[PDB]
Amino acid sequence: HKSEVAHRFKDLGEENFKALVLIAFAQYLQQCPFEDHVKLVNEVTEFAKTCVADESAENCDKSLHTLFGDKLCTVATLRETYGEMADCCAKQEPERNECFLQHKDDNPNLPRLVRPEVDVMCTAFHDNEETFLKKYLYEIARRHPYFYAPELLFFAKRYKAAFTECCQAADKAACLLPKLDELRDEGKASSAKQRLKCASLQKFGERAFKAWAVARLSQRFPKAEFAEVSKLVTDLTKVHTECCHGDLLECADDRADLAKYICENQDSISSKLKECCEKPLLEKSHCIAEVENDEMPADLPSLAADFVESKDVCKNYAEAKDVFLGMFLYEYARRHPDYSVVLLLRLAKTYETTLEKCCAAADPHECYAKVFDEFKPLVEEPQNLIKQNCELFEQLGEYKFQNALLVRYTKKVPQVSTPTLVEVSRNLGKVGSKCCKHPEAKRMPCAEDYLSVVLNQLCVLHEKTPVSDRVTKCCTESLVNRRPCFSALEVDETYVPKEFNAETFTFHADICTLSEKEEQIKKQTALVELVKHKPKATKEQLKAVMDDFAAFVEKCCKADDKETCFAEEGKKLVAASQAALG
Ligand SMILES: COc1ccc2c(c1)c(CC(=O)O)c(C)n2C(=O)c1ccc(Cl)cc1
Ligand SMILES: CCCC1C(=O)N2C(N(C)C)=Nc3ccc(C)cc3N2C1=O
Ligand SMILES: CCCCCCCCCCCCCC(=O)O
Ligand SMILES: CCCCCCCCCCCCCC(=O)O
Ligand SMILES: CCCCCCCCCCCCCC(=O)O
Numbered sequence: 285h286k287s288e289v290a291h292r293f294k295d296l297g298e299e300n301f302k303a304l305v306l307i308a309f310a311q312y313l314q315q316c317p318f319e320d321h322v323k324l325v326n327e328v329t330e331f332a333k334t335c336v337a338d339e340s341a342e343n344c345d346k347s348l349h350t351l352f353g354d355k356l357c358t359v360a361t362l363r364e365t366y367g368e369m370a371d372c373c374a375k376q377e378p379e380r381n382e383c384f385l386q387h388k389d390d391n392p393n394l395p396r397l398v399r400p401e402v403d404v405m406c407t408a409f410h411d412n413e414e415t416f417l418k419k420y421l422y423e424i425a426r427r428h429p430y431f432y433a434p435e436l437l438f439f440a441k442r443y444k445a446a447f448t449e450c451c452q453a454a455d456k457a458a459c460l461l462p463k464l465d466e467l468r469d470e471g472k473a474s475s476a477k478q479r480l481k482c483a484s485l486q487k488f489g490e491r492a493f494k495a496w497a498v499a500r501l502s503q504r505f506p507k508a509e510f511a512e513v514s515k516l517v518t519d520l521t522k523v524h525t526e527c528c529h530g531d532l533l534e535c536a537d538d539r540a541d542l543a544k545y546i547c548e549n550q551d552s553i554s555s556k557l558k559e560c561c562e563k564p565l566l567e568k569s570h571c572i573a574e575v576e577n578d579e580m581p582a583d584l585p586s587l588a589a590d591f592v593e594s595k596d597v598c599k600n601y602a603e604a605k606d607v608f609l610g611m612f613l614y615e616y617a618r619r620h621p622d623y624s625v626v627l628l629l630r631l632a633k634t635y636e637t638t639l640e641k642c643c644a645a646a647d648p649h650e651c652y653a654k655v656f657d658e659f660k661p662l663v664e665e666p667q668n669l670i671k672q673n674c675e676l677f678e679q680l681g682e683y684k685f686q687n688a689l690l691v692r693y694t695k696k697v698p699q700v701s702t703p704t705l706v707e708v709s710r711n712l713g714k715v716g717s718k719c720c721k722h723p724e725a726k727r728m729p730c731a732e733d734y735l736s737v738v739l740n741q742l743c744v745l746h747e748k749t750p751v752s753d754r755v756t757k758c759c760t761e762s763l764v765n766r767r768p769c770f771s772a773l774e775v776d777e778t779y780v781p782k783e784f785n786a787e788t789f790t791f792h793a794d795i796c797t798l799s800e801k802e803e804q805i806k807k808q809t810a811l812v813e814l815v816k817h818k819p820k821a822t823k824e825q826l827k828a829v830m831d832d833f834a835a836f837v838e839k840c841c842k843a844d845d846k847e848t849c850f851a852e853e854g855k856k857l858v859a860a861s862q863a864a865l866g
């Protein structure tokens with residue numbers, strides 16, 4: 285109302301207010317030490333309390349942007365540490381805020397964060413829960429300047445819960461570790477999806493963004509009217525535009541307004557939004573963004589009715605193309621929660637290409653009469669890959685499934701560096717152990733969101749260190765043709781085998797003491813190298829070599845004088861295997 289800081293403070297609550305202020309500062313002043321931020325927070329919090337006590341106290345009338353910028357310009361070493369950014373302090377609002385946004389470095393040069401020993405973490409956690417948690421909230425935020433603050437807050441709390449539970453455990457490590465690994469992975473995926481989405485908005489434009497959103501929103505909210513979904517797509521697009529620009533405040537408010545709109549009109553949107561709408565102001569957006577799909581209306585007609593058999597098809601389409609196509613998408617998506625979003629777009633594109641040709645023909649109705657037959661092969665392709673790949677993962681385990689993929693992709697793109705192939709294959713492998721668990725009706729949507737991040741990360745690296753035109757093609761292809769393009773890659777006939785290197789296939793006893801994740805990544809690295817040396821080797825030949833090796837290890841690790849063994853048999857294996865592969 286009269287004082288914005290006061291209002292925010294009352295809504296958020298002291299604890300959340302302080303966490304968010306800390307994050308907001310760490311994202312702009314990525315170089316200042318922890319103690320410096322803690323002091324700014326205390327000062328802002330104290331200031332906020334004065335305003336809560338008296339909305340009319342000095343400066344309490346100033347906007348959050350102005351107050352925020354004034355404090356930022358207080359930093360004494362602003363110029364010495366941030367050089368150019370200091371000049372922003374000479375500008376007036378709103379140029380000042382815009383100037384700050386431009387200097388936020390999406391990827392600073394900070395040391396990697398090393399995970400301490402379980403006991404040290406747990407002890408630090410017990411001795412000062414507050415500074416332990418705020419210390420890492422700081423380290424994470426400064427490293428991910430665009431990570432939406434509230435979401436980061438949500439991760440912190442999941443972190444607190446892991447220590448609280450695990451540090452009291454009998455086997456602290458057995459409890460805590462797997463929790464941290466899951467948190468990290470989920471944290472990495474959330475950050476990558478945010479980056480991906482904003483980058484895509486820049487490349488493909490608003491149209492492609494609206495299409496993706498209509499489809500997505502129709503699956504989750506199948507009972508909502510097309511106009512409401514359109515309303516929602518419109519606002520959602522503004523929201524992502526604002527949020528991508530980087531202004532935390534603008535973004536936060538846009539999201540809040542949308543979640544309230546949605547909660548007020550919930551009975552006309554979805555019946556699954558009950559819980560989400562009762563939760564705290566700070567948790568609404570997040571919750572609704574993850575809400576499960578509502579049940580689709582039981583009495584829904586046939587699409588062929590309004591889109592294939594109708595006589596006004598071309599007349600309606602011409603009158604407002606995107607609207608008509610949007611309607612098609614809406615109708616198709618809410619009937620297919622089991623389809624991935626990208627598949628729905630492929631169907632809409634197909635239907636669009638068809639109407640463009642057909643509506644410019646003598647007898648339209650006859651020209652587009654069998655379009656739904658066009659859809660079949662589009663739908664079946666992804667489905668079959670899912671079946672085939674999940675069956676194979678059922679037989680082999682996560683580890684051996686990862687090796688099968690390793691062989692498969694190394695043969696397809698032999699130019700990619702070995703470490704890159706190992707990482708991508710391992711991740712593809714996890715997508716398999718995470719999605720094949722769901723029933724068929726939920727597999728495709730699952731593979732899509734996970735595969736989208738893996739595929740983009742793969743493309744980012746390669747972009748830096750280009751190595752294959754084919755990968756580059758798939759990487760710069762339409763957002764809808766991406767995964768299909770990679771699926772289409774065929775074995776590389778060109779590739780001339782990498783010459784033999786003794787060292788590369790010589791192993792020592794140190795392999796026996798390595799941890800599981802360590803041994804695997806080591807055997808898997810030799811495997812890629814094996815394939816790059818003998819790309820014409822069949823599955824059979826390769827399978828027999830991996831068996832000798834398998835034995836080789838188990839044998840030498842369970843026998844006196846390891847060193848000699850791995851050096852004596854190393855000769856035999858490498859010699860024998862080389863002969864079996866010619
Ligand atoms: C409901 O609104 C959207 C809009 C775009 C989305 C998503 C959700 C999700 C998440 C979800 O599937 O719900 C992902 C992964 N999007 C993209 O990758 C993407 C695609 C095209 C463009 Cl132009 C920009 C971004
Ligand atoms: C993944 C679910 C699709 C999806 C969804 O339901 N969303 C939603 N609402 C409330 C409809 N509001 C948003 C607010 C912020 C973000 C970052 C994303 C969404 N938005 C989506 O992207
Ligand atoms: C979001 C930060 C919450 C603070 C919880 C402390 C636990 C984080 C320690 C893990 C940092 C090492 C990075 C890693 O997991 O590899
Ligand atoms: C300088 C004090 C301002 C602190 C900035 C944080 C205020 C934003 C409120 C967040 C509201 C959550 C909205 C949502 O995403 O659901
Ligand atoms: C308000 C409705 C907006 C949606 C318009 C429907 C367009 C769907 C056609 C498929 C577009 C795929 C995007 C692309 O490849 O550029």
Ligand SMILES: CCCCCCCCCCCCCC(=O)O
Nearest residue numbers: 789807810811830833834858861
């Ligand atoms: C040309 C020398 C070939 C000998 C080296 C063989 C290395 C293959 C690695 C075996 C990986 C299989 C993994 C496993 O045993 O589970």
